[PDB]
């Protein structure tokens, strides 16, 4: 593969609390256009959660996490982060970071089909 993604962080967190997930990109990183977190909650389809356009830092969220999660990047260190603030039970899921080197319009930024490279999947478990 020409890009590799490795996640770190995750695990247990109390409701209302915060955790930060990280994703380190390696390989052909200058060409990455979006870094985007997906998740797959228990017994659900995978869904796009938070997308970041690398050129500008603009961000796009699924409705259920708006006002709670923040995605950010560190271009120099080829990192993306998901700040899971204000966590809720509905957030328990496998979180997986995706990346693409092919620009797509914003309306496709949360679609699975837009991404070519994937991290390993990281469990986050919220307690009430």
Author numbering: 0 to 127
Paper quotes:
Among them, miniature single-domain antibodies derived from the variable region of the heavy chain-only antibodies of camelids have gained relevance due to their high therapeutic potential and the robust techniques employed to generate them. The usefulness of VHHs relies on their ability to specifically recognize antigens with high affinity despite their small size. The kinetic parameters of the interaction between the VHH antibody termed D3-L11 and its antigen HEL were determined by surface plasmon resonance (SPR) analysis at 25 °C. The values of the association rate constant (kon = 6.1 ± 1.6 × 106 M−1 s−1) and dissociation rate constant (koff = 7.9 ± 1.7 × 10−4 s−1) were determined as described in the methods section, resulting in a dissociation constant in the sub-nanomolar range (KD = 0.13 ± 0.04 nM).
The X-ray structure of WT D3-L11 in the absence of the antigen was also determined, achieving a resolution of 1.15 Å. The coordinates of unbound D3-L11 were aligned to those of the antibody in complex with HEL using the Cα atoms of the residues of the framework region (FR). The conformation of the residues contributing to the affinity did not change significantly in the unbound form compared to the antibody-antigen complex (RMSD = 0.76 Å among main chain α-carbons). Collectively, the X-ray data suggests that the interface residues of VHH contributing to binding the antigen adopted a rigid conformation. The structural data showed only minor differences in the conformation of the main chain between unbound and bound D3-L11, suggesting that preorganization of the interaction surface is a key aspect of the mechanism of recognition. The rigidity of the residues comprising the interaction surface would ensure a highly cooperative mode of interaction of the three CDR loops, enhancing the affinity for the antigen. To clarify the conformational fluctuation of these residues, the R2 dispersion parameters were determined by NMR. Those residues with significant fluctuations (Rex > 5 s−1) were exclusively located in the FR3 (Lys74, Met78, Tyr80). Except for Val103, residues in the CDRs showed little fluctuation, suggesting that the CDRs were little dynamic in solution, in agreement with the conclusions extracted from the crystallographic data. In conclusion, the paratope of the VHH antibody D3-L11 recognized its epitope by a lock-and-key mechanism, and is organized similarly to that of a conventional antibody (Fvs).
